[PDB]
Paper text:
Substituting His/Phe with Ser/Ile should expand the substrate-binding pocket to accommodate the bulkier substrate PET, and the strategy termed “double mutation (DM)” has proven to be useful to enhance PET hydrolytic activity of several IsPETase-like enzymes.
We obtained the apo-form crystal structures of wild type and inactive variant S155A of CtPL-DM, which adopt the canonical α/β-hydrolase fold and are highly identical to the structure of IsPETase (Cα RMSD 0.477 Å and 0.471 Å). In both structures, a sugar that is covalently linked to N220 was observed. Protein sequence analysis indicates that there are three putative N-glycosylation sites in addition to N220 including N168, N181 and N261. Nonetheless, W180 in F235L-S155A, which carries N181A mutation, shall be able to wobble freely. On the other hand, the conformational change of W180 in CtPL-DM and CtPL-DM-S155A is restrained by the glycosylated N181, thus impedes the binding of PET.
Numbering used by the authors: 23 to 292
The structure:
């Protein structure tokens, strides 16, 4: 009933469909300054406090630039977000899983460095992952291999075998793009959703009439996907149950019965 991780005002649909109440800054993380991952783009609230840490991976030949929406939209709702670049454009999901792990390790280190823009902004104990395509698989692999992680949002996950995810205990929200021809939802995203233990808080939202890149910068679903992603991270990274209506109740139903959505699965309520 006391939630120490609680931040921002009581959520409204309209507030969650746009940049949040937290002023943010971004800096880049040079490839040369890190091993474990290929650098990337760091977004953080300027307000004093410690926030959940979120690492986001692009997919095959993907760059951090294509997911800056996720950096800005999540950070502005009260998170520290690192959208990574990979060691190589050709890294497979198991590799993207290690890099997400290492990027989260990096944020924890920088959190103790008085020179860092994120000095004392990172709650080391509250970590989440997300990613596009092979980055989505990577995010679910990292969540499997780091069960202390609070949340995973695989977005249009590629074809890591759904078998690999039968022991995921980390609350997982999967985005699908209905007319994805690169990672068809019916053979890729949906079997992964179904492979996750039913005791694991989970959710699948499928964007109607859109392709593999419907979740990326300019995909055309900033309002709805952002609102779902913010709500998933708030719910599980911040244990903020004010966000339940947006993933399980009235405001989720609004979204998931809307023309924008072609499929919806979940083990609600939570
Ligand atoms: C998991 O839940 C699904 C969806 O309701 C159900 O089909 C399946 O039997 C459940 N799995 C187990 C192991 O009970
Ligand atoms: Ca689109």
């Amino acid at each position: 009933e006391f939630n120490p991780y609680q931040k921002g005002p009581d959520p409204t649909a309209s507030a969650l469909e746009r940049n949040g109440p937290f002023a943010i800054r971004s800096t880049s993380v040079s490839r040369t300054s890190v091993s474990g991952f290929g650098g990337g783009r760091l977004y953080y609230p300027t307000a004093s406090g410690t926030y959940g840490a979120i690492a986001v991976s692009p997919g095959f030949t993907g760059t951090s630039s294509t997911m800056t929406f996720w950096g800005e939209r999540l950070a502005s709702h009260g998170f520290v977000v690192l959208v990574i670049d990979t060691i190589t454009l050709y890294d497979q999901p198991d590799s993207r899983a290690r890099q997400l792990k290492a990027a989260l390790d990096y944020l924890a280190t920088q959190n103790g460095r008085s020179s860092s823009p994120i000095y004392r902004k990172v709650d080391t104990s509250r970590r989440a992952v997300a990613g596009h395509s092979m980055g989505g698989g990577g995010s679910l692999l990292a969540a499997r291999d780091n069960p202390s992680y609070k949340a995973a949002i695989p977005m249009a996950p590629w074809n890591t075998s759904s078998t690999a995810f039968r022991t995921v205990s980390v609350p997982t929200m999967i985005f699908g793009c209905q007319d994805d021809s690169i990672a068809p939802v019916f053979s890729s995203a949906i079997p992964i959703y179904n492979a996750i233990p039913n005791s694991t808080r989970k959710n699948y939202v499928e964007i109607r009439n859109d392709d593999h890149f419907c979740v990326m910068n300019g995909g055309g679903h900033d309002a709805t996907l952002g609102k779902l992603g913010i709500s998933w991270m708030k719910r599980f990274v911040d244990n903020d149950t004010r966000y339940s209506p947006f993933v399980c109740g009235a405001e989720y139903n609004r979204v998931v019965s809307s023309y924008e959505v072609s499929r919806s699965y979940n083990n609600c309520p939570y």
